[PDB]
């Protein structure tokens, strides 16, 4: 069963630092492009960042460019978001969202309301 467990989120003072860790299980982590998305209070699921299968390709949403660094440890089957310079508007539930199909550059539907290959989310309050 495809499971994505986020951890490490918690209360952080504004301008602080934090590290969200996504433990993946039930699938070959290396074959899948990975994403971080966030549900802000009262807003839809905004997409934060994505990283390719091998980690060679990385992209961020504008609001976190340079602030956050996404990374993936294929050996440990895990994903990381190192979060820095956190402003209060970063308070959200962070979901570690897997792309649906392996080996594919497209990453359809990770921001959908009830996407399946998405983690339970970890709260980050700033």
Partner 1 sequence: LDQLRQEAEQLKNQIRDARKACADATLSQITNNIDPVGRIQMRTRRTLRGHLAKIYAMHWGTDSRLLVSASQDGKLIIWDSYTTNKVHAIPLRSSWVMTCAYAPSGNYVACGGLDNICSIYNLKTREGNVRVSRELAGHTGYLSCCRFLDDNQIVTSSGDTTCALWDIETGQQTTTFTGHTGDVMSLSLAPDTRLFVSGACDASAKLWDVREGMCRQTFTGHESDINAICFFPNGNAFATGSDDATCRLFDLRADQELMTYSHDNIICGITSVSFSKSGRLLLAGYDDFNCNVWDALKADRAGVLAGHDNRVSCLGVTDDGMAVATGSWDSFLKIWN
Partner 2 sequence: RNEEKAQREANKKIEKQLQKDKQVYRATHRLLLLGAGESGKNTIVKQMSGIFETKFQVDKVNFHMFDVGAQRDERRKWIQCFNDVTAIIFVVASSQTNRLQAALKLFDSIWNNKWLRDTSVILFLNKQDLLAEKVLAGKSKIEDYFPEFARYTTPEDATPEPGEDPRVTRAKYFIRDEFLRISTASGDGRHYCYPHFTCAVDTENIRRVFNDCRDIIQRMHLRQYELL
Residues that bind partner 2 (CB under 8 A): 38, 40, 43-47, 61-63, 65-66, 100-101, 104-115
Q: Please say which residue, 58 or 116, places its beta carbon nearer to partner 1.
A: 116
CB of 110: closest distance to partner 1 in angstroms?
Answer: 13
Q: Please say which residue, 11 or 116, places its beta carbon nearer to partner 2.
A: 116
CB of 109: closest distance to partner 1 in angstroms?
Answer: 9
Residue 114 touches partner 1, criterion: CB under 8 A: yes
- Give the Cα separation of 96 and 49 in Å (integer): 10
| From candidates 84, 100, 125, 126, binder to partner 1 by CB under 8 A | 100
- Give the Cα separation of 46 and 37 in Å (integer): 6
Residue 41 touches partner 1, criterion: CB under 8 A: no
Give the largest Cα separation in the chain, rounded.
Answer: 39
Residue 10 touches partner 1, criterion: CB under 8 A: no
CB distance 20 to 95 below 8 Å: no
Residue in the block written with tokens 């549900």: 39
Residue closest to 89 by CA, chosen among 57, 50, 43: 43
Residue closest to 61 by CA, chosen among 52, 70, 53: 70
Residue 101 touches partner 1, criterion: CB under 8 A: yes
- Give the Cα separation of 90 and 16 in Å (integer): 11
Report the interface residues with partner 1, using CB under 8 A. Answer: 1-2, 26-28, 100-103, 114, 116-117, 120
């Amino acid at each position: 069963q495809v499971q994505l467990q986020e951890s490490g989120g918690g209360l952080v003072q504004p301008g602080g630092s934090l590290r969200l860790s996504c433990a993946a299980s039930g699938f070959t982590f290396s074959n899948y492009k990975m994403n971080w998305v966030r549900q802000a209070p009262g807003k839809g699921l905004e997409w934060v960042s994505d990283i390719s299968q091998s980690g060679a390709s990385i992209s961020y949403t504008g609001s976190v460019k340079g602030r956050f660094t996404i990374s993936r440890d294929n050996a440990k089957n895990t994903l990381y978001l190192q979060m820095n310079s956190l402003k209060p508007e970063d308070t959200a539930v962070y979901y570690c969202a897997r792309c649906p199909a392996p080996f594919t550059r497209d990453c359809f539907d990770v921001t959908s309301t009830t996407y399946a290959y998405r983690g339970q989310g970890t709260q980050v309050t700033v």
